[PDB]
Amino acid sequence: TSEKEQQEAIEHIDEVQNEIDRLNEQASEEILKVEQKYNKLRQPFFQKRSELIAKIPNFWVTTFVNHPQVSALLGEEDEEALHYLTRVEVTEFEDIKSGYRIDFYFDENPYFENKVLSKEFHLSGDPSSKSTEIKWKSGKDLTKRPESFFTWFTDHSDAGADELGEVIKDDIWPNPLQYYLVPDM
Amino acid sequence: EKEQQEAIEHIDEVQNEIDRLNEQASEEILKVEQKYNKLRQPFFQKRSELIAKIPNFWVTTFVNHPQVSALLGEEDEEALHYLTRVEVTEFEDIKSGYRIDFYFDENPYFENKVLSKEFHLSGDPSSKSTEIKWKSGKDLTKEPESFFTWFTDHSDAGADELGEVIKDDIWPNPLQYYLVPDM
Numbered sequence A: 001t002s003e004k005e006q007q008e009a010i011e012h013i014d015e016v017q018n019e020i021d022r023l024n025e026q027a028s029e030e031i032l033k034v035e036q037k038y039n040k041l042r043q044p045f046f047q048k049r050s051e052l053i054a055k056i057p058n059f060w061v062t063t064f065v066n067h068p069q070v071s072a073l074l075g076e077e078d079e080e081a082l083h084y085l086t087r088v089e090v091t092e093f094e095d096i097k098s099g100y101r102i103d104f105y106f107d108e109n110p111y112f113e114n115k116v117l118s119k120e121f122h123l124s125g126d127p128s129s130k131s132t133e134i135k136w137k138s139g140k141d142l143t144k145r146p147e148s149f150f151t152w153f154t155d156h157s158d159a160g161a162d163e164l165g166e167v168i169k170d171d172i173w174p175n176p177l178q179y180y181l182v183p184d185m
Numbered sequence B: 001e002k003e004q005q006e007a008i009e010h011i012d013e014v015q016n017e018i019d020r021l022n023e024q025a026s027e028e029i030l031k032v033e034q035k036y037n038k039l040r041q042p043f044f045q046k047r048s049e050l051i052a053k054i055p056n057f058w059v060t061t062f063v064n065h066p067q068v069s070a071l072l073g074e075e076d077e078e079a080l081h082y083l084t085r086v087e088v089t090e091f092e093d094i095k096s097g098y099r100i101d102f103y104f105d106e107n108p109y110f111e112n113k114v115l116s117k118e119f120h121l122s123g124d125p126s127s128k129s130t131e132i133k134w135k136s137g138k139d140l141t142k143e144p145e146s147f148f149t150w151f152t153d154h155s156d157a158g159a160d161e162l163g164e165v166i167k168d169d170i171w172p173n174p175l176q177y178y179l180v181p182d183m
């Protein structure tokens, strides 16, 4: 093959591979549309699940206590605070890549005045996170002398390496029932 | 008890329906991959013809690949000189598995015209390869283990890194690795 002919072939290959890239980019769009369709399709069922969960005392504290990774993040008084956690929600943003948000809904409690505690994650791919400010009632669990579970809300250094955020989103939220249930004899 | 064990049963029923919706999404996504597999196939075909006009295309692609480069010994590169064509075929239903074909020209190392390794899913991950008919005094028996031992490795069938790298990374776009920027 000629020295020119090879560079002609390389030019042809580049043109063929641009169309394969186009075909790949169009497939990954169609796939994201399918995820967006089933995100809305599942959301009423998660809505139904939350209502049933809210009639089960200590559901979410128990799931967390029996989870192999999250259990180690809970102190003694953290569990007392999580008693008041009635509802956990996870919301992927529409385009999915943008990021996701996690909501912890609390009943009136001795620790803080917030009705909801949230932590959201954002992505070019520049990982960031931002949380609601916890209005503690002169009983901050993070300024008492182990590190409290609730410091997670004020931690933003890892952002893209937020392990707990990923475990709640990918593991606990899809199926919390496995951890709540304890096999008896 | 009446309430909790009923609620636990209700929760299980709702999550059974979520699993059903998940299974229905993974079907619809599988249809999209099958549609675009057929659309890409004529372009891979034309690419194959253009590649066969390029000496040492696949050896160079492998040598410049961050993971596969470490799998090549010195004499492995000499053998891969004769690799004219690489093909990847996902089976129609996708779940069944896929096959990778390596087409060689007549070479001093083995008599095979094609070397293949296919991956299958009872539903246990499995793989099978063509038997390499090495010639007298050329083999994989001694660098670390030769590149060609990949063909005879079948323990981690579901965890075949090289197979997944070729299928998902190198096969879609080998040109990026062949091309080296000059200044």
Ligand SMILES: [Ca+2]
Binding pocket: A066, A178, A179, A180, A181, A182, A183
């Ligand atoms: Ca359990």
Ligand SMILES: [Ca+2]
Binding pocket: B064, B176, B177, B178, B179, B180, B181
């Ligand atoms: Ca390159």
